[PDB]
């Protein structure tokens, strides 16, 4: 997905596609780069699932949210980068057998964004 | 920048809030870092 601070640009290399599009024009804008790869500018006007058009037509539904969650998710992923990071509605961290130091690091990073789910 | 100059094993990054990170820092270095913490409220140790 692309859900991040509004206006995030993401490029995804794929197989050749005729075009790339979004079900709702407001939420996300789409352009083809190299004739195969996707370039998505997430306007993030609203939160919803999206349908994407190609030549092959494979659809990967994207849930889009504005970051006051997406930008915060990216920064936590970078700083922590066994841990798993998901966006959901609130940034969520999950893991099975993480070390106590990593848990302390995660709860320290908790202070940056109030709505985190550990 | 000023924190980097003053402290200059510790690593300094900007991110959104200035972040200090290190593995096996000596206790004196930690004390120095938390002392410089008063310079800017938004620091992540």
PDB file of C-alpha atoms in Angstrom:
ATOM      1  CA  UNK A   1       0.000   0.000   0.000  1.00  0.00           C
ATOM      2  CA  UNK A   2       0.905   3.697  -0.193  1.00  0.00           C
ATOM      3  CA  UNK A   3      -0.912   5.086   2.858  1.00  0.00           C
ATOM      4  CA  UNK A   4       1.485   7.674   4.238  1.00  0.00           C
ATOM      5  CA  UNK A   5       1.632  11.418   4.785  1.00  0.00           C
ATOM      6  CA  UNK A   6      -0.581  12.869   2.072  1.00  0.00           C
ATOM      7  CA  UNK A   7       1.282  13.260  -1.200  1.00  0.00           C
ATOM      8  CA  UNK A   8       3.560  10.232  -0.887  1.00  0.00           C
ATOM      9  CA  UNK A   9       5.075   9.133  -4.208  1.00  0.00           C
ATOM     10  CA  UNK A  10       5.809   5.426  -4.596  1.00  0.00           C
ATOM     11  CA  UNK A  11       7.306   3.565  -7.561  1.00  0.00           C
ATOM     12  CA  UNK A  12       6.710  -0.185  -7.875  1.00  0.00           C
ATOM     13  CA  UNK A  13       8.454  -2.155 -10.659  1.00  0.00           C
ATOM     14  CA  UNK A  14       6.113  -4.679 -12.258  1.00  0.00           C
ATOM     15  CA  UNK A  15       5.534  -6.412 -15.568  1.00  0.00           C
ATOM     16  CA  UNK A  16       4.429  -4.279 -18.548  1.00  0.00           C
ATOM     17  CA  UNK A  17       1.098  -2.543 -17.921  1.00  0.00           C
ATOM     18  CA  UNK A  18      -0.952  -0.383 -20.283  1.00  0.00           C
ATOM     19  CA  UNK A  19      -1.941   2.121 -17.592  1.00  0.00           C
ATOM     20  CA  UNK A  20      -2.393   2.550 -13.846  1.00  0.00           C
ATOM     21  CA  UNK A  21      -5.532   4.075 -12.329  1.00  0.00           C
ATOM     22  CA  UNK A  22      -7.488   4.567  -9.102  1.00  0.00           C
ATOM     23  CA  UNK A  23     -11.167   3.935  -8.410  1.00  0.00           C
ATOM     24  CA  UNK A  24     -11.572   7.326  -6.715  1.00  0.00           C
ATOM     25  CA  UNK A  25      -9.799  10.200  -8.431  1.00  0.00           C
ATOM     26  CA  UNK A  26      -9.521  12.281  -5.263  1.00  0.00           C
ATOM     27  CA  UNK A  27      -7.857   9.650  -3.081  1.00  0.00           C
ATOM     28  CA  UNK A  28      -4.953   8.685  -5.328  1.00  0.00           C
ATOM     29  CA  UNK A  29      -3.420   9.723  -8.656  1.00  0.00           C
ATOM     30  CA  UNK A  30      -1.566   7.278 -10.877  1.00  0.00           C
ATOM     31  CA  UNK A  31       0.981   7.335 -13.715  1.00  0.00           C
ATOM     32  CA  UNK A  32       2.929   4.695 -15.625  1.00  0.00           C
ATOM     33  CA  UNK A  33       6.729   4.856 -15.587  1.00  0.00           C
ATOM     34  CA  UNK A  34       8.953   2.775 -17.918  1.00  0.00           C
ATOM     35  CA  UNK A  35       5.752   1.278 -19.382  1.00  0.00           C
ATOM     36  CA  UNK A  36       5.848  -1.505 -16.781  1.00  0.00           C
ATOM     37  CA  UNK A  37       6.190   0.188 -13.413  1.00  0.00           C
ATOM     38  CA  UNK A  38       3.622   1.978 -11.259  1.00  0.00           C
ATOM     39  CA  UNK A  39       4.069   5.516  -9.936  1.00  0.00           C
ATOM     40  CA  UNK A  40       1.395   6.397  -7.388  1.00  0.00           C
ATOM     41  CA  UNK A  41       0.961   9.860  -5.910  1.00  0.00           C
ATOM     42  CA  UNK A  42      -1.284   9.310  -2.923  1.00  0.00           C
ATOM     43  CA  UNK A  43      -3.335  12.473  -2.572  1.00  0.00           C
ATOM     44  CA  UNK A  44      -4.924  10.810   0.480  1.00  0.00           C
ATOM     45  CA  UNK A  45      -8.103  12.880   0.315  1.00  0.00           C
ATOM     46  CA  UNK A  46     -10.073  10.049   1.914  1.00  0.00           C
ATOM     47  CA  UNK A  47      -9.713   6.621   3.486  1.00  0.00           C
ATOM     48  CA  UNK A  48     -11.032   3.754   1.360  1.00  0.00           C
ATOM     49  CA  UNK A  49     -10.110   0.664  -0.596  1.00  0.00           C
ATOM     50  CA  UNK A  50      -8.956   1.222  -4.166  1.00  0.00           C
ATOM     51  CA  UNK A  51      -9.251  -0.556  -7.507  1.00  0.00           C
ATOM     52  CA  UNK A  52      -6.320  -0.289  -9.924  1.00  0.00           C
ATOM     53  CA  UNK A  53      -6.472  -0.807 -13.696  1.00  0.00           C
ATOM     54  CA  UNK A  54      -3.655  -2.283 -15.782  1.00  0.00           C
ATOM     55  CA  UNK A  55      -3.187  -4.165 -19.009  1.00  0.00           C
ATOM     56  CA  UNK A  56      -3.017  -7.476 -17.145  1.00  0.00           C
ATOM     57  CA  UNK A  57      -5.472  -5.948 -14.678  1.00  0.00           C
ATOM     58  CA  UNK A  58      -4.202  -7.414 -11.401  1.00  0.00           C
ATOM     59  CA  UNK A  59      -5.714  -5.453  -8.512  1.00  0.00           C
ATOM     60  CA  UNK A  60      -4.024  -4.904  -5.147  1.00  0.00           C
ATOM     61  CA  UNK A  61      -6.452  -3.080  -2.872  1.00  0.00           C
ATOM     62  CA  UNK A  62      -4.812  -0.179  -1.042  1.00  0.00           C
ATOM     63  CA  UNK A  63      -6.088   1.407   2.161  1.00  0.00           C
ATOM     64  CA  UNK A  64      -4.976   5.040   2.342  1.00  0.00           C
ATOM     65  CA  UNK A  65      -4.660   7.188   5.477  1.00  0.00           C
ATOM     66  CA  UNK A  66      -3.142  10.626   6.032  1.00  0.00           C
ATOM     67  CA  UNK A  67      -0.285  10.901   8.481  1.00  0.00           C
ATOM     68  CA  UNK A  68      -0.891  13.565  11.195  1.00  0.00           C
ATOM     69  CA  UNK A  69      -0.050   7.064  10.642  1.00  0.00           C
ATOM     70  CA  UNK A  70       1.703   6.347   7.355  1.00  0.00           C
ATOM     71  CA  UNK A  71       4.709   8.630   7.746  1.00  0.00           C
ATOM     72  CA  UNK A  72       5.037   7.561  11.376  1.00  0.00           C
ATOM     73  CA  UNK A  73       4.863   3.932  10.282  1.00  0.00           C
ATOM     74  CA  UNK A  74       7.655   4.530   7.780  1.00  0.00           C
ATOM     75  CA  UNK A  75       9.888   6.250  10.325  1.00  0.00           C
ATOM     76  CA  UNK A  76       9.359   3.532  12.939  1.00  0.00           C
ATOM     77  CA  UNK A  77      10.108   0.913  10.300  1.00  0.00           C
ATOM     78  CA  UNK A  78      13.368   2.699   9.518  1.00  0.00           C
ATOM     79  CA  UNK A  79      14.465   3.143  13.135  1.00  0.00           C
ATOM     80  CA  UNK A  80      13.640  -0.423  14.152  1.00  0.00           C
ATOM     81  CA  UNK A  81      15.006  -1.723  10.855  1.00  0.00           C
ATOM     82  CA  UNK A  82      11.954 -10.145  13.899  1.00  0.00           C
ATOM     83  CA  UNK A  83       9.561  -7.247  14.378  1.00  0.00           C
ATOM     84  CA  UNK A  84       6.531  -6.778  12.145  1.00  0.00           C
ATOM     85  CA  UNK A  85       5.037  -3.397  11.271  1.00  0.00           C
ATOM     86  CA  UNK A  86       1.472  -2.896  10.028  1.00  0.00           C
ATOM     87  CA  UNK A  87      -0.584   0.212   9.370  1.00  0.00           C
ATOM     88  CA  UNK A  88      -4.204  -0.841   9.937  1.00  0.00           C
ATOM     89  CA  UNK A  89      -6.012   2.114  11.444  1.00  0.00           C
ATOM     90  CA  UNK A  90      -3.281   2.815  13.997  1.00  0.00           C
ATOM     91  CA  UNK A  91       0.364   1.878  13.615  1.00  0.00           C
ATOM     92  CA  UNK A  92       0.725  -1.612  15.096  1.00  0.00           C
ATOM     93  CA  UNK A  93       3.887  -3.457  16.127  1.00  0.00           C
ATOM     94  CA  UNK A  94       3.819  -7.215  16.573  1.00  0.00           C
ATOM     95  CA  UNK A  95       6.323  -9.971  17.240  1.00  0.00           C
ATOM     96  CA  UNK A  96       6.598 -13.301  18.982  1.00  0.00           C
ATOM     97  CA  UNK A  97       9.846 -13.665  20.940  1.00  0.00           C
ATOM     98  CA  UNK A  98      11.428 -10.224  20.863  1.00  0.00           C
ATOM     99  CA  UNK A  99      14.273  -9.433  23.220  1.00  0.00           C
ATOM    100  CA  UNK A 100      13.686  -7.110  26.189  1.00  0.00           C
ATOM    101  CA  UNK A 101      15.974  -4.466  24.690  1.00  0.00           C
ATOM    102  CA  UNK A 102      13.901  -4.383  21.509  1.00  0.00           C
ATOM    103  CA  UNK A 103      10.732  -4.069  23.581  1.00  0.00           C
ATOM    104  CA  UNK A 104      12.258  -1.134  25.455  1.00  0.00           C
ATOM    105  CA  UNK A 105      13.229   0.459  22.145  1.00  0.00           C
ATOM    106  CA  UNK A 106       9.678   0.030  20.850  1.00  0.00           C
ATOM    107  CA  UNK A 107       8.059   1.551  23.927  1.00  0.00           C
ATOM    108  CA  UNK A 108      10.565   4.396  23.700  1.00  0.00           C
ATOM    109  CA  UNK A 109       9.542   5.046  20.098  1.00  0.00           C
ATOM    110  CA  UNK A 110       5.944   4.931  21.344  1.00  0.00           C
ATOM    111  CA  UNK A 111       6.304   8.524  22.546  1.00  0.00           C
ATOM    112  CA  UNK A 112       6.532   9.904  19.014  1.00  0.00           C
ATOM    113  CA  UNK A 113       2.957   9.018  18.010  1.00  0.00           C
ATOM    114  CA  UNK A 114       0.257   8.565  20.678  1.00  0.00           C
ATOM    115  CA  UNK A 115      -1.860   6.075  18.673  1.00  0.00           C
ATOM    116  CA  UNK A 116       0.383   3.018  18.559  1.00  0.00           C
ATOM    117  CA  UNK A 117      -0.731  -0.537  19.279  1.00  0.00           C
ATOM    118  CA  UNK A 118       1.905  -2.806  20.804  1.00  0.00           C
TER     119      UNK A 118
ATOM    120  CA  UNK B   1      24.280  20.037  14.181  1.00  0.00           C
ATOM    121  CA  UNK B   2      25.239  21.570  17.520  1.00  0.00           C
ATOM    122  CA  UNK B   3      24.631  18.273  19.319  1.00  0.00           C
ATOM    123  CA  UNK B   4      26.866  16.560  16.768  1.00  0.00           C
ATOM    124  CA  UNK B   5      29.616  19.114  17.353  1.00  0.00           C
ATOM    125  CA  UNK B   6      29.402  18.876  21.145  1.00  0.00           C
ATOM    126  CA  UNK B   7      29.288  15.084  21.278  1.00  0.00           C
ATOM    127  CA  UNK B   8      31.777  14.873  18.413  1.00  0.00           C
ATOM    128  CA  UNK B   9      30.280   5.295  19.072  1.00  0.00           C
ATOM    129  CA  UNK B  10      27.194   7.482  19.349  1.00  0.00           C
ATOM    130  CA  UNK B  11      25.227   8.077  16.147  1.00  0.00           C
ATOM    131  CA  UNK B  12      23.116  11.134  15.332  1.00  0.00           C
ATOM    132  CA  UNK B  13      20.107  11.225  13.007  1.00  0.00           C
ATOM    133  CA  UNK B  14      17.452  13.813  12.238  1.00  0.00           C
ATOM    134  CA  UNK B  15      14.266  11.974  11.250  1.00  0.00           C
ATOM    135  CA  UNK B  16      11.410  14.078  12.560  1.00  0.00           C
ATOM    136  CA  UNK B  17      12.856  14.561  16.039  1.00  0.00           C
ATOM    137  CA  UNK B  18      16.602  14.414  16.555  1.00  0.00           C
ATOM    138  CA  UNK B  19      17.527  10.858  17.534  1.00  0.00           C
ATOM    139  CA  UNK B  20      20.629   9.600  19.340  1.00  0.00           C
ATOM    140  CA  UNK B  21      21.433   5.907  19.098  1.00  0.00           C
ATOM    141  CA  UNK B  22      24.291   3.677  20.187  1.00  0.00           C
ATOM    142  CA  UNK B  23      24.980   0.185  21.432  1.00  0.00           C
ATOM    143  CA  UNK B  24      27.557   0.119  24.232  1.00  0.00           C
ATOM    144  CA  UNK B  25      27.985   3.756  25.213  1.00  0.00           C
ATOM    145  CA  UNK B  26      29.899   4.523  28.375  1.00  0.00           C
ATOM    146  CA  UNK B  27      27.876   5.894  31.311  1.00  0.00           C
ATOM    147  CA  UNK B  28      29.644   9.251  31.078  1.00  0.00           C
ATOM    148  CA  UNK B  29      28.577   9.588  27.446  1.00  0.00           C
ATOM    149  CA  UNK B  30      24.983   8.818  28.414  1.00  0.00           C
ATOM    150  CA  UNK B  31      25.166  11.458  31.144  1.00  0.00           C
ATOM    151  CA  UNK B  32      26.518  13.971  28.631  1.00  0.00           C
ATOM    152  CA  UNK B  33      23.696  13.145  26.214  1.00  0.00           C
ATOM    153  CA  UNK B  34      20.948  13.519  28.805  1.00  0.00           C
ATOM    154  CA  UNK B  35      22.608  16.754  29.903  1.00  0.00           C
ATOM    155  CA  UNK B  36      22.438  18.134  26.370  1.00  0.00           C
ATOM    156  CA  UNK B  37      18.825  16.933  26.288  1.00  0.00           C
ATOM    157  CA  UNK B  38      17.863  20.257  27.890  1.00  0.00           C
ATOM    158  CA  UNK B  39      18.959  22.056  24.718  1.00  0.00           C
ATOM    159  CA  UNK B  40      15.970  20.777  22.706  1.00  0.00           C
ATOM    160  CA  UNK B  41      12.809  19.231  24.200  1.00  0.00           C
ATOM    161  CA  UNK B  42      12.131  16.950  21.189  1.00  0.00           C
ATOM    162  CA  UNK B  43      15.037  14.521  21.400  1.00  0.00           C
ATOM    163  CA  UNK B  44      14.742  10.742  21.282  1.00  0.00           C
ATOM    164  CA  UNK B  45      17.389   8.812  23.209  1.00  0.00           C
TER     165      UNK B  45
END
